[PDB]
Design a protein around this nucleic acid. Sequence first.
RNA 1: ACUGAACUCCUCACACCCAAUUGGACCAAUCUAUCACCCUAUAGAAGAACUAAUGUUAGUAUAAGUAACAUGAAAACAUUCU
Lengths: 287, 275, 132, 166, 152, 108, 148
Amino acid sequence: SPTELTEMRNDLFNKEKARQLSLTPRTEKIEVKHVGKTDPGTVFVMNKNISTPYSCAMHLSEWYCRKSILALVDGQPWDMYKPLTKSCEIKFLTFKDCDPGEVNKAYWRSCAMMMGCVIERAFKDEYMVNLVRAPEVPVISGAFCYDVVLDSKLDEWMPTKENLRSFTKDAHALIYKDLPFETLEVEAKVALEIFQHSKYKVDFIEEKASQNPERIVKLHRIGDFIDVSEGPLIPRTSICFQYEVSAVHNLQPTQPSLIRRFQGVSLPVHLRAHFTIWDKLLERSRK
Amino acid sequence: VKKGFRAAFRFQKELERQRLLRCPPPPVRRSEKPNWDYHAEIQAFGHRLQENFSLDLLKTAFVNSCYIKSEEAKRQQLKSNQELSEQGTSFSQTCLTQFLEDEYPDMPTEGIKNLVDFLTGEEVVCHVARNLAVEQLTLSEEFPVPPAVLQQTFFAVIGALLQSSGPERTALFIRDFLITQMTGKELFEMWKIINPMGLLVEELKKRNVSAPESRLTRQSGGTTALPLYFVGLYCDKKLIAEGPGETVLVAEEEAARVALRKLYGFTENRRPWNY
Amino acid sequence: NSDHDRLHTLVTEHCFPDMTWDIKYKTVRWSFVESLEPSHVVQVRCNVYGQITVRMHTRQTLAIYDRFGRLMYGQEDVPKDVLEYVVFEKQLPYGSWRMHTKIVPPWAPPKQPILKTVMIPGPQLKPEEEYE
Amino acid sequence: ISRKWEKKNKIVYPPQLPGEPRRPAEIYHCRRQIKYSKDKMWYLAKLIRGMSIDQALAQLEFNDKKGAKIIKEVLLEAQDMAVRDHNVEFRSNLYIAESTSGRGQCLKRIRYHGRGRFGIMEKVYCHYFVKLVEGPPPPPEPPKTAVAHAKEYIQQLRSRTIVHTL
Amino acid sequence: ISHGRVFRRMGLGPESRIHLLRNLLTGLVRHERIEAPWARVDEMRGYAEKLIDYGKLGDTNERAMRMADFWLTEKDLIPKLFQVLAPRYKDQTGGYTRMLQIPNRSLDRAKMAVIEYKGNCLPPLPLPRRDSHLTLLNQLLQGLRQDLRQSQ
Amino acid sequence: AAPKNRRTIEVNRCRRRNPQKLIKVKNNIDVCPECGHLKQKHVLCAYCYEKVCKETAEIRRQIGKQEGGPFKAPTIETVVLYTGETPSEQDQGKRIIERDRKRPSWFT
Amino acid sequence: TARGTPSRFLASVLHNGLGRYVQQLQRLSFSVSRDGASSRGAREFVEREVIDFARRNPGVVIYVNSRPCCVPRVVAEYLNGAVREESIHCKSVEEISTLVQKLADQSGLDVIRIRKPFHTDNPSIQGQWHPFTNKPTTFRGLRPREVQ
RNA sequence: ACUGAACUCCUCACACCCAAUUGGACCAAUCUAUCACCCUAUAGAAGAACUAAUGUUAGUAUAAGUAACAUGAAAACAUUCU
Ligand SMILES: [Mg+2]
Ligand SMILES: [Mg+2]
Ligand SMILES: [Mg+2]
Ligand SMILES: [Mg+2]
Ligand SMILES: [Mg+2]
Ligand SMILES: [Mg+2]
Ligand SMILES: [Mg+2]
Ligand SMILES: [Mg+2]
Ligand SMILES: [Mg+2]
Ligand SMILES: [Mg+2]
Ligand SMILES: [Zn+2]
């Protein structure tokens, strides 16, 4: 049953969490220096593999915590809730930086993942849904996409406007829940064990483990929903303010199975768009 | 400064009273407070209850195993009440079953068992013991005496009464101090049930009667936010019980509850218990 | 137990502020367990004030809490081995041998890590200054 | 006079058991004898009640009232001592649990009126008190909905008894 | 009722208002950047623009010279007006001044403004900058722009 | 006219704790992305403005030293140059105000 | 006054009369002074009446301290845990006797306003009145002006 | 017909609803004798009891954060200007 699948996947997720936490016991003070333009030269002594860029922001001030979406720990984008590993330089990236491209990509991935959760828990039980992948599309594309294979019983069914609005309502319920984005650097073995059923996710995990030198893969969970991340994600789901599942386009070349691309669009609280601009963005997010 | 001492002392007394009210001292078992003689207290316990306990049995009934363990641990730096409590619990359950089965011959064994469990449960027996001063005479390792220990001691006292004066006197004691705890209580306030309609259907099957027909006898304010629905259950066009409610479902459920009470003979206007 | 009356006689006045200042408004559950090697004297020197250096390699337990009773340093159960070079001073007519100062060598191992994280501000910048 | 607020920082609670929720830190601070009306100070105190430390500082930095600067200094001192002496891990993880103004010891001066008559001026002084509690500010009390409010009404209806009878 | 009244009531009357604005304008011409209560800066901004226009009219223009003589209480600034400021703005047609709000005056909490003549040698004011075009919203709008350009 | 009765603390509280009298929470406060300082949306950052005012004061002191007397306003443009800077081609024919510090990052 | 005072409902301790009557007073403690005119009456009570009272009330444990604090007193402790302390200062033997007998006959429940002079757990035998008692029913349960 | 009092009856208890005035039974606190030696007793005393004198002194309210009061401008704080 899908509920049992989610339960066992969550159990494996927590098992791996505890395993890594035990692997990193006690407290090793790592020095992380704020290399950001503001408040330069500050140093945080932090608990190895326990503290997070969020904890560093908490030390800095509440404005940093609320405005900071990603961290460039040693020039690499780290999730705000991803435990720090070694002494490093840290700089916090917001939505309004001069070049926020990394933050935009992270927001885009997180919105896609939220869409994936909504899709998987939307349809009636009898129908089976397979979350194939979240294609990495530029923000200029105007809509974040999530690819899903629906059942043959539904390959002839296209969502109605009311169905799409129900998807948006579920997404907003998730936003209201405001669930943190939990991360795990998990070896391909445990990742495959978690996603054994989903063939698509299995092969995606294999691809990622091939691309990276080792077999380390990025697993992300909002709540009860675990997915492979193409990269770092947003800290929490409350960052999204405006969110809309706009359309579902059936990819033209579908001989084996019919891949439906759920397209949607979102804007965070920091970058709220007026009603009319939002309507135009919605219109353009249906292509 | 005004000369005098009495006003100052009165103010000190008032301050002390207020201090005790604001930060009352942690509770202390009555034994540790002044004016305590265990032998006199236990004899008074017996005389209060109007029963000729044997002092040795009652003393043994008031001592718990945990108290013995704590006393031995302290002595490092006695017969418990276990057997008496077991005897008392067994006899009390059996004799309460006798009382209840005599009073309500129609009550099903499940109902009788639930009533006995209610009457001998931690809450009821704890209340009875507390207001009978069992707690004061109880020798336990922690204070206030936990309800489980208090129940154990109360049933040990019942066992001591049994060994001292006999089944008849012990039955009178149970009647007076546990059977009274169901006065004013409602059948399903004591015996928690689910799906009373289903339970009534089961009972009517046992009696070889068809499933009752739920039917709306009286109604008021149907479309408002405070409706009144009277739902009656009919057995062959004959009303067996009707009940009120806010929604039709609630009224039907409670009519089933009324029907169960009537079938089991545990109605509100039933013959009172005889003492 | 913050027995300052006895601590005054037990330690020198030069040591008492160190003993009792930073520990104010926080409970410590320091305890002792059997030593590892016998204590022996190291050296002694000398209006006239006595001075004895004693080397100890004992085993101890620490648990320092907050005003609010939440642990902030050291497990209370797991003991640690302590190497100390304690220097006693005595008054020379009615004074006794009291802890004067503990010599920490530079090669001593780092102390226990602290549970909580800490931020260390960089150099504050004036309006006319720039970070370099 | 009373100086209980200062003493409130010196109460040491017993060490907590491991299976016990972490007690939030509490920092009491005060400034006494501020040359300012307690009635005027009360508005600033009320303004910042229940807000995070950073939010309170932001609000006070852009307030024109004289008392805002004094309250900001008191809050900054409270934050500093919370970090240094009350084992508060994060500076910003503090919210104003209590903030009130109290009457200070005042001085009486004469105001000369027009016909050889006079009034008694009071050179008013005020105290300012804050308690800072560690943790996020407690959420504002949600406005009660029609559903809950009708639930309360129906509970009141059900509570009715037949009064003055058997 | 003050429907359509465009001039604030400042100082001790009309003449005093003119003199106050004149002193502010002389300070502005001398220093190229002046802090003053917001309302007074707002009232004087129009006069500053008009002086730049009169300086553009030319040194030899008698009316412009008389206007400058009245409006610049320090007469060393009249050559400055006719030979530095006016040539500086010869290309522009307007908007010679930049006025920004400044934190309230500490003394009396007055609403304060800084008014400068654009192009001065002084360090630039911390001007407000719009959000970067690379932000999420701006990139989505750029996508709209490109799609509209292509489609239509 | 004189009050006919003392106003009770209850009435006084109802009056002086009215929302109309309470201080309103400001919602236009934010953080200056340049220096991270707090500022109001429509107002200049206080810290940045203080920087600029101090630098302007220093430059003006240099200007005053150069002019040497009242009523000596130059009829030519002005250019501020810091240590290690040379007048450019367009800086020709403009009075040079020399500053002993290095060029501020925000000064261009 | 009633509005300025707590109130309760008439009640017993453990249904004190149903099966058997149990005297709720369980302990009396007389703190009496050897010397002092305040406790002269208490001394006479201890000499002449306390023994007879004790043998009349075998369920009440009576302690006599002969060493009071701030006044001679009698502290009555009841089974329900209530403790009523009464000064016997400057009271005669008969006054103390009546006071002690009152404590003996009284229950531990608070002496406050009792809302009702009666207490039934089963106020109704024929069924509590509701608007539909005495209201006739109609054929097919048709409400007034109902078409069918 | 019913309703209808503090009238009357009923269960229990009773000295327990006038101004001025008058008779009487008690009594807070204080001091003294002698006790008690715990916070009281018997007596002897007396600056012996305050919801009220536009009472006296002190405190703090209300009116009220009200009436009212105050700093010419810019600036390099040298200075200049009105
Ligand atoms: Mg005069
Ligand atoms: Mg004016
Ligand atoms: Mg009548
Ligand atoms: Mg009469
Ligand atoms: Mg007098
Ligand atoms: Mg008085
Ligand atoms: Mg008076
Ligand atoms: Mg006032
Ligand atoms: Mg008024
Ligand atoms: Mg006025
Ligand atoms: Zn800034």
